[PDB]
Design a protein around this ligand. Structure first.
Ligand SMILES: O=C(c1ccc(Br)s1)[C@H]1CNC[C@@H]1c1ccc2c(=O)[nH]cnc2c1
Lengths: 337, 20
């Protein structure tokens, strides 16, 4: 049963959460091939495990930059959570370690690239295409929320496409285990729920708002609230007004009105029936939730992978030498990593 | 069009997170 499945999932998660894996590899066990993505304090590189020849995506975080940007706790969150979870649509954390200068998280490689890249290129997804992806996010948030985890950075840039055309969620940088409410202003402007912006405390319901933004962006080709500057975006978000493209179906608009709901006592995912209000909505009437979970549904498209280390579905990035100092930096701050 | 306004905007590229 569902209850039995989630109970076991929590048991598995709590053991690893209370006793996190630590120092399970070394940098010299990998050959660095190419940068797959970048951030303010690090990058993700395609690497090859020289022993097994397996390819991975290694996130490399500069410890000094993390400290400078006040992301210590968020980074500890990311690693502790990601090593503890297990779900078909979550990227797997295979190894983690640190050296004098950097933190390392060696993750499952997703050769299909980011959803963002495909969405921007083709313009928008059809509703069935968008629904297929949305269903996987609904199940992923059901899983995460049951563990008292809020994800807090949903967007196409953070959704990887695997070899089967299914999603793998990555970037747990803002993920947090919280039972009550929290207050950190973090996320991406286009995807912030009103309650985050109005600085009044918030909960897992911000993830369901973000799901609304994502479905809108997938189906429209642009997000529901955009402008040149974040301040203008925030004003639109809190307004309680959304405009829909004329090609949006009636069912899609009704769903989005209930996800992009400013009032928490009315937002889908946050009512008495929980995620079931979403799952049972007419827009998802054709969705076989069990088949989605079992990966038995044919994907809208599969990325052609002409090799285990093919990166043709990724943009090219400025490469930089991985510098490791002869002196240990920020030792105390990252002790538990 | 809204699509046209989006594409002419400065936020069609990868969006940075804020924190904060
Ligand atoms: O480059 C990335 C970074 C995140 C933080 C730093 Br401050 S840099 C991420 C961002 N959006 C997807 C991107 C990324 C790219 C590829 C993979 C992959 O193949 N597997 C697992 N995770 C991945 C993450």
């Amino acid at each position: 049963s569902v209850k039995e499945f989630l109970a076991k999932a929590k048991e598995d998660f709590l053991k690893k959460w209370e006793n996190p894996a630590q120092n399970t590899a070394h940098l010299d066990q990998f050959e660095r091939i190419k940068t797959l993505g970048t951030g303010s304090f690090g990058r993700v590189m395609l690497v090859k495990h020289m022993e097994t020849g397996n390819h991975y995506a290694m996130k490399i975080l500069d410890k000094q930059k993390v400290v400078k940007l006040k992301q210590i706790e968020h980074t500890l969150n990311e690693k502790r959570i990601l090593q503890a979870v297990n779900f078909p649509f979550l990227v797997k954390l295979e190894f983690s370690f640190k050296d004098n200068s950097n933190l390392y998280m060696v993750m499952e490689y997703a050769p299909g690239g980011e959803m963002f890249s495909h969405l921007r290129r083709i313009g928008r997804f059809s509703e069935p295409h968008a629904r297929f992806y949305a269903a996987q996010i609904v199940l992923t948030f059901e899983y995460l929320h049951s563990l008292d985890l809020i994800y807090r950075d949903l967007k196409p840039e953070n959704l990887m496409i695997d070899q089967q055309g299914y999603i793998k969620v990555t970037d747990f940088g803002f993920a947090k285990r919280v039972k009550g409410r929290t207050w950190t202003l973090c996320g991406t402007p286009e995807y912030l729920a009103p309650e985050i912006i109005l600085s009044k405390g918030y909960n897992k319901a911000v993830d369901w708002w973000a799901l609304g933004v994502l479905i809108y962006e997938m189906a429209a080709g642009y997000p529901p609230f955009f402008a040149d500057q974040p301040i203008q975006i925030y004003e639109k978000i809190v307004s309680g007004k959304v405009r829909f493209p004329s090609h949006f179906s009636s069912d899609l608009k009704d769903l989005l009105r209930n996800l992009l709901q400013v009032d928490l006592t009315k937002r889908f995912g946050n009512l008495k029936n929980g995620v079931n209000d979403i799952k049972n909505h007419k827009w998802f009437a054709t969705t076989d939730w069990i088949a989605i979970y079992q990966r038995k549904v044919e994907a809208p498209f599969i990325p052609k992978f002409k090799g285990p280390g093919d990166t043709s579905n990724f943009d090219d990035y400025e490469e930089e030498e991985i510098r490791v100092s002869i002196n240990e930096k920020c030792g105390k701050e990252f002790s538990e990593f | 069009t809204t699509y046209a306004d989006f594409i002419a905007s400065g936020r069609t590229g990868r969006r940075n997170a804020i924190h904060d």
